[PDB]
């Protein structure tokens, strides 16, 4: 039919994407071996003796995570060529992953992509999972985004980036890698969804009451989100929305495509079944800042656009009722120039669960992908971090050493300044 | 994939290196003979990082033993887990460097690098993709500080891409060995800053202080000090050997803790450290780990950490554990101890979950911190250096061996800039 290619770059990209492929394999009823005992065609191909192979490529420079998948239980589920490994780690150096060690692996990467895209015409687009703060995640992520932009210039390219958190970092050179990647994904990608690590830690703490979480709890929640975005492609629904019409309803200007995420409900095993996830309150449990998945308070922002994807026992009457009560509720503000700021998508198939995992069965759910002007704080915060580094050229000698010219820091700084000014202008 | 090459130089380097291969073999379940026992996949799936198969099933270390007296090489061989090292990897000195950095580097060590650089070339080149080197050596001593630094210099200009990290012990604060500490320590430091990527600093007075109040051991030998320091060594490179939720190699840490090139000196800590008596009266959880791990009474290097500011730091957690309370505790310790940290750098901390705990414990953390508080030690070494140098004391041994007058002035000029660079950012 019409398919989508998922690309995983970096350690975060591998780990988040594998939760995605655990969920996709589960809901379509295919085994870890890869054979079932035309709806699944959007994520799995056909192969010989009734076995299905995913449309994913695994990329990392260090082998320590992609070799572990090969020895995992899904050893026969993926194509051997589709999991590509190097020998040396990028090591938090955007310069290293983009110039030195990036070129020897990018060619092998886009060979497989060329073969997997040429299987059938009329495919939707690309999903890319990467770590911004990471080395290969930002480095190799840009190289594929550059080279796919020139070849497959036509199509949609969606990005789900694990954006670095405000206080929590998981690095210290991460302000450098953030502003360097931002220059490289402003004019080469179509829609970017910003994710925060410690925001989902907040979600697991108060909504789901997991006092003691882990990365397996992170990637389950992300996999539920990605399945909700691509639910309309796979299963029949009352009112579908595809990945082509995401950028139509959410991207007003070519520069401005940085948009947050939210999911509801995030409810426990025992907690859930004893209270109705009413359609009215399932959205009221989505528009509050604490449920938002970025640690970026939209109260001092303005919502520019909003796209809701319902899944399960959802009727069109309650969707229109839930939208109306939100718009008349005062605590959120819409921009003056966008009256038709809602786009509703309804899918019939209920959310699937990973049994004995983290979440439970609920009869309905909603996933939010909303574009706002709240993003002005997270780039200004990143800028304020960056100017103190750049005040006396800290950690620059590691970047300039490999072959990156000094001064690319200067031009990427002013681009983030140019990006910061546009967001301030549009919010009037 | 990746292999780490071990180099053991000097008296201190051999002893801390012999005990280091004791715990790695313990971790991977290696028999003192060289065989394997423990019948599990996870120990053996990544073993070529430290070991090599021999078509007898036995695993040999990728370690090069190096000394100018055959006595301390004999003792390492003659101990348990001594048969494990290859006989060919031993290299011998027939003369012996008596504390003199000159003969360790210019005269006597110069003709023995030729022998040992061959050994390290054969082992490193034979691998698929080298990652880097680790070197354990002393700086007080002659062979450790002298030849250990020369070998650092030679392989940097040969392999300029690969990482290097050193487990170096410093001259102790209160009492000392090797009376020419500044003529050995300072002469190594200005060369160590030029050709090394990470330096992890150990003090003996710190290890005595740790072993006193925490472990309550009455009689600490170098058996337990080397055991303790080796516990910190395995914690650094655990993510290379075992699967984990957040992996972190050496190169991960180097770009992470080094703002500026010349400042790459660290401050090592390990947790938990409790006596056998008080083993079961604590609650071994991630709130309690972080309180113990950030302490002035826990660091392996006896520079006071709350006299300075933490520039950058990293906490590499280990064990079957979980990634939000370790994540929140990093935010918590950073929010409360605002004055203890640097201001212009936010989000200083790092988290790296290493899913396999150190053997016999359940949940641990190693702490590698780039602090500006270690400027006290460079002054105090340099304070001692100025007094001896202005009086031309003990110099006739160094200048008799073929070292220049100019070299000492250049060295003192180098570290004085190093102090001033650290000092400026307080």
């Amino acid at each position: 039919m019409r398919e989508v290619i998922s690309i995983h770059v970096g350690q975060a990209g591998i780990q988040i994407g594998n939760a995605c492929w655990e969920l996709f394999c589960l809901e379509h009823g295919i085994q870890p071996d890869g054979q079932m005992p035309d709806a699944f065609n959007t994520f799995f191909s056909e192969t010989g003796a009734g076995k299905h192979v995913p449309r994913c490529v695994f990329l990392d420079l260090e082998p320590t995570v992609v070799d572990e998948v090969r020895t995992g239980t899904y050893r026969h589920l993926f194509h051997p060529e589709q999991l590509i490994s190097g020998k040396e780690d990028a090591a938090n150096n955007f310069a290293r992953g983009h110039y030195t060690i990036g070129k020897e692996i990018v060619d092998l990467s886009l060979d497989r992509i060329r073969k997997l895209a040429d299987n059938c015409t009329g495919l939707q687009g690309f999903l890319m999972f990467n770590a911004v703060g990471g080395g290969t995640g930002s480095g190799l992520g840009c190289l594929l985004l550059e080279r796919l932009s020139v070849d497959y210039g036509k199509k949609s390219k969606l990005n789900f980036c694990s954006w670095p958190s405000p206080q929590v970092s998981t690095a210290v050179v991460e302000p450098y890698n953030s502003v360097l990647s931002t220059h490289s994904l402003l004019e080469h990608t179509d829609v970017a969804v910003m994710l925060d690590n410690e925001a989902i830690y907040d979600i697991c703490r108060r909504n789901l009451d997991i006092e003691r979480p882990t990365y397996t709890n992170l990637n389950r929640l992300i996999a539920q989100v990605i399945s909700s975005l691509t639910a309309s492609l796979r299963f029949d629904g009352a009112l579908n929305v595809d990945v082509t019409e995401f950028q139509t309803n959410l991207v007003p200007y070519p520069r401005i495509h940085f948009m947050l995420s939210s999911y509801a409900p995030i409810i426990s095993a025992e907690k859930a079944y004893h209270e109705q996830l009413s359609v009215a309150e399932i959205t009221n449990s989505a528009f509050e800042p604490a449920s938002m998945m970025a640690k970026c308070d939209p109260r001092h922002g303005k919502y520019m656009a909003c796209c809701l994807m319902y899944r399960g026992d959802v009727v069109p009457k309650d969707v229109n009722a839930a939208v109306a009560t939100i718009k008349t509720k005062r605590t959120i503000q819409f921009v003056d120039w966008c009256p038709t700021g809602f786009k509703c998508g309804i899918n019939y198939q209920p959310p699937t669960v990973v049994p004995g995992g983290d979440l439970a069965k609920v009869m309905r759910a909603v996933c939010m992908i909303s574009n706002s002007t709240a993003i002005a704080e997270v780039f200004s915060r990143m800028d304020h971090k960056f100017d103190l580094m750049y005040a006396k050229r800290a950690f620059v000698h590691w970047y300039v050493g490999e072959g990156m010219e000094e001064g690319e820091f200067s031009e990427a700084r002013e681009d983030l300044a140019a990006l910061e000014k546009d967001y301030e202008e549009v919010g009037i | 994939m990746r292999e780490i090459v071990h180099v053991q130089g000097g008296q201190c380097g051999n002893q801390i290196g012999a005990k280091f291969w004791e715990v790695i073999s313990d971790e991977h379940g290696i028999d003192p003979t060289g065989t394997y026992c423990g019948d599990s996949d996870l120990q053996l799936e990544r073993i070529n990082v430290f070991y090599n198969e021999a078509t007898g099933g036995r695993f040999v270390p990728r370690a090069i033993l190096m000394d100018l007296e055959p006595g301390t090489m004999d003792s390492v061989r003659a101990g348990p887990f001594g048969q494990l090292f290859r006989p060919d990897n031993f290299v011998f000195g027939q003369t012996g460097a008596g504390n003199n950095w000159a003969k360790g580097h210019y005269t006597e060590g110069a003709e023995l690098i030729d022998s040992v650089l061959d050994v390290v070339r054969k082992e490193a080149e034979g691998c698929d993709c080298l990652q880097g080197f680790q070197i354990t050596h002393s700086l007080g001593g002659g062979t450790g500080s002298g030849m250990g630094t020369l070998l650092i210099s030679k392989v940097r200009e040969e392999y300029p891409d690969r990482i290097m990290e050193t487990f170096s012990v410093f001259p102790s604060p209160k009492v000392s060995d090797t009376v020419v500490e500044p003529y050995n320590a300072t002469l190594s430091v200005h060369q160590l800053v030029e050709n090394a990527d990470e330096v992890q600093v150990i003090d003996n007075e710190a290890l005595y202080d740790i072993c006193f109040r925490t472990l309550k051991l009455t009689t600490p030998t170098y058996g337990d000090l080397n055991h303790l320091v080796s516990a910190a060594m395995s914690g650094v490179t655990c993510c290379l050997r075992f699967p984990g939720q957040l992996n972190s190699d050496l190169r991960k840490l180097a770009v992470n803790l080094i703002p500026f090139p010349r400042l790459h000196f660290f401050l090592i800590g390990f947790a938990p450290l409790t006596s056998r008596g008080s083993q079961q009266y604590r609650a071994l959880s991630v709130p309690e780990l972080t309180q113990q791990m950030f302490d002035a009474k826990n660091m392996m290097c006896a520079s006071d950490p709350r006299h300075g500011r933490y520039l950058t730091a990293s906490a590499m957690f280990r064990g079957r554990m979980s990634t939000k309370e370790v994540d929140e505790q990093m935010l918590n310790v950073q929010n409360k101890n605002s004055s203890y940290f640097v201001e212009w750098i936010p989000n200083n901390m790092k988290s790296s979950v290493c899913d396999i705990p150190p053997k016999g414990l359940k949940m641990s953390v190693t702490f590698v911190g780039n602090s500006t508080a270690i400027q006290e030690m460079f002054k105090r070494v340099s304070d001692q250096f100025t007094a001896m140098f202005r009086r031309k004391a003990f110099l006739h041994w160094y200048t008799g061996e073929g070292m220049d007058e100019m070299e000492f002035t250049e060295a003192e000029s180098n570290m004085n800039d190093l102090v001033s660079e650290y000092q400026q950012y307080q």
Partner: peptide, 22 residues
């Protein structure tokens, strides 16, 4: 005088065989 190795990867503990939706 060692003990068993009883540490399990995050991957293997939750990426397991799964019972299919009907």
């Amino acid at each position: 005088p060692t003990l068993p190795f009883n540490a399990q990867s995050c991957y293997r503990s939750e990426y397991v065989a799964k019972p299919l939706p009907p």
